[PDB]
Design a protein around this nucleic acid. Sequence first.
DNA 1: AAAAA
DNA 2: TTTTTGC
DNA 3: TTTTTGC
DNA 4: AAAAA
Length: 346
Amino acid sequence: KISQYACQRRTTLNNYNQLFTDALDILAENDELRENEGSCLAFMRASSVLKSLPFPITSMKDTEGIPCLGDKVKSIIEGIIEDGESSEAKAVLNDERYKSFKLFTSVFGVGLKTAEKWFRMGFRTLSKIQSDKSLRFTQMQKAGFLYYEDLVSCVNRPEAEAVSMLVKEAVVTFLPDALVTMTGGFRRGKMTGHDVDFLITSPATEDEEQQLLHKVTDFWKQQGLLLYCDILESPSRKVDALDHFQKCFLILKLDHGRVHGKGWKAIRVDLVMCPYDRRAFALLGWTGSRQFERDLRRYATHERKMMLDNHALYDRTKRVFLEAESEEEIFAHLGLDYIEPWERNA
DNA sequence: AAAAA
DNA sequence: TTTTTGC
DNA sequence: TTTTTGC
DNA sequence: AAAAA
Ligand SMILES: [Mg+2]
Ligand code: NA
């Protein structure tokens, strides 16, 4: 019935097991900070498989037949079926390491290692951190502190629609033939997001594309609507977290009047530039979710003896690179039924 | 993957 | 070298 | 038991 | 922490 793979389950934003998944998300994040990568992912898969259920769990008889639920997970569910609360998750939420890790990493530029550095030093608040002379923050870390309250108050659908109008007009100006598609959470029909993602491709000067990202940003800097900027340069690809595509991580100023206190709002924007021939691979890889993508790869590997990434799909048996002009072709190659963006919310 | 430190 | 960034 | 768990 | 080899 139900598959252990996120790519073989239709997961919508209509969750009936929110009580359970919230508890499991906390328990995963707890093993994330302790670097217990195996345990972390176990709770990530249990929480993911539950978000796919077309009904709410009311009894233990309901869990039977559902994969990714072993002893530990079935007990979390057992604990919630009665109380209506998780004693495991309510414990983690009241832990100093966790509270501080969750807090510190919520800053743009701060991750696992820096949060652990600050916590070991004896820090617990972002205020005592900011008011220290002995410390030295990066260009990401300074921007993260500067626009904290605005980046922490996650983006909304009208705000994302204002950004997508601004990004398209600026990209359309320096390149008119280019197709610009909004990726990430907002492509999967989300209402709230941490950031706004985009994919840029034009059907195509090898020299012109390389200037595209710089053309649109410098143009936004001339208007002074570019608060933060960082650009990155562009077979059988593996052990590479982020793809080999040209890309940029920005913080842009969104004037209140463009979206239908101070008159502004800092918004996190990710732009990705890829060759036209890779459009399908890039879109699939940037739509997400995290759990859908990692399972797409895990499926290809373990079930199809193939190699999936954001650039291509390689069949090891037939020793050929399977091309695609759409997402539907990549799914068909993998022998997976099509799961449209809105149902990739794993 | 790149780019900062 | 080590850290951060992304779905 | 030992290995894998996403690029 | 769970499932496969
Ligand atoms: Mg996003
Ligand atoms: Na961060």
